[PDB]
Design a protein around this motif. Sequence first.
Motif, short mmCIF file in Angstrom:
data_model
loop_
_atom_site.label_atom_id
_atom_site.label_comp_id
_atom_site.label_asym_id
_atom_site.label_seq_id
_atom_site.Cartn_x
_atom_site.Cartn_y
_atom_site.Cartn_z
N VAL A 1 0.68 -1.71 -0.34
CA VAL A 1 -0.34 0.01 0.07
C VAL A 1 1.18 1.26 0.03
O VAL A 1 0.64 2.80 -0.62
CB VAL A 1 -1.26 -0.32 0.70
N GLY A 2 1.81 0.72 0.62
CA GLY A 2 3.38 1.95 0.46
C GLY A 2 3.32 2.79 -0.78
O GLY A 2 3.44 4.09 -0.91
N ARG A 3 3.54 1.81 -1.42
CA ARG A 3 3.93 2.00 -3.00
C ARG A 3 3.47 2.17 -4.09
O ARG A 3 3.20 3.15 -4.71
CB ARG A 3 5.09 0.46 -3.04
N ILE A 4 1.75 1.37 -3.69
CA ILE A 4 0.68 1.92 -4.34
C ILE A 4 0.19 3.31 -3.81
O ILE A 4 -0.23 4.06 -5.39
CB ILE A 4 -0.67 1.05 -4.33
N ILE B 1 -2.51 0.33 -9.97
CA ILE B 1 -2.63 -0.20 -9.03
C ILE B 1 -1.31 -1.72 -8.99
O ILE B 1 -0.82 -1.72 -7.72
CB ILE B 1 -4.21 0.09 -8.02
N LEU B 2 -1.54 -2.51 -9.38
CA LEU B 2 -0.78 -3.43 -9.39
C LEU B 2 1.09 -3.16 -9.85
O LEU B 2 2.01 -3.62 -8.82
CB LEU B 2 -1.69 -4.95 -10.27
N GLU B 3 0.87 -2.46 -10.82
CA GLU B 3 2.35 -1.95 -11.05
C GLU B 3 2.99 -1.49 -9.76
O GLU B 3 3.70 -1.42 -9.71
CB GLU B 3 1.98 -0.93 -11.82
N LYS B 4 1.97 -1.02 -8.60
CA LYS B 4 2.85 -0.62 -7.60
C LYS B 4 2.91 -1.94 -6.84
O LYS B 4 3.83 -2.26 -6.57
CB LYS B 4 2.00 0.34 -6.72
N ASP C 1 7.37 -2.70 -4.80
CA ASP C 1 7.95 -2.96 -3.79
C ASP C 1 7.67 -4.51 -2.89
O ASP C 1 8.69 -4.62 -2.84
CB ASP C 1 6.33 -2.59 -2.64
N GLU C 2 6.47 -5.50 -3.83
CA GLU C 2 7.00 -6.61 -3.21
C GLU C 2 8.34 -7.50 -3.65
O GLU C 2 9.00 -8.33 -2.58
CB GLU C 2 6.27 -7.45 -4.33
N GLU C 3 8.85 -6.65 -5.01
CA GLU C 3 10.83 -7.13 -5.57
C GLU C 3 11.64 -6.14 -4.38
O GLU C 3 11.83 -6.25 -3.81
CB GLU C 3 10.57 -6.95 -7.04
#
Length: 104
Positions: free
Chosen positions: A26-29, A80-83, A87-89
């Motif tokens: 959420v922080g990156r999105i 939204i997913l692109e973010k 962060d996931e990686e």
Amino acid sequence: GSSGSSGILTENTPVFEQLSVPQRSVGRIIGRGGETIRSICKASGAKITCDKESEGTLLLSRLIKISGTQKEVAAAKHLILEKVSEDEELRKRIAHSASGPSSG
């Protein structure tokens, strides 16, 4: 599960979808304070908001709400997913837990 696409309307009928995202993504999105959630809403046109009924402090996972025309609600969902993936990686590139397939 991945396959599963569909969507019909009259020409621009409104839509309401929800995407559950972790407090780690959420922080990156949403960004530092929305600066990221503001550029996406304008890039897709779909209204994006964060849960409310819940405290929304830092339980475990957050939830977002996407609204608009099949055109946006569908496009915004992608942004939204692109973010979320970023962060996931990004968190894995710094943590690196005995893993990291980087050959290709």
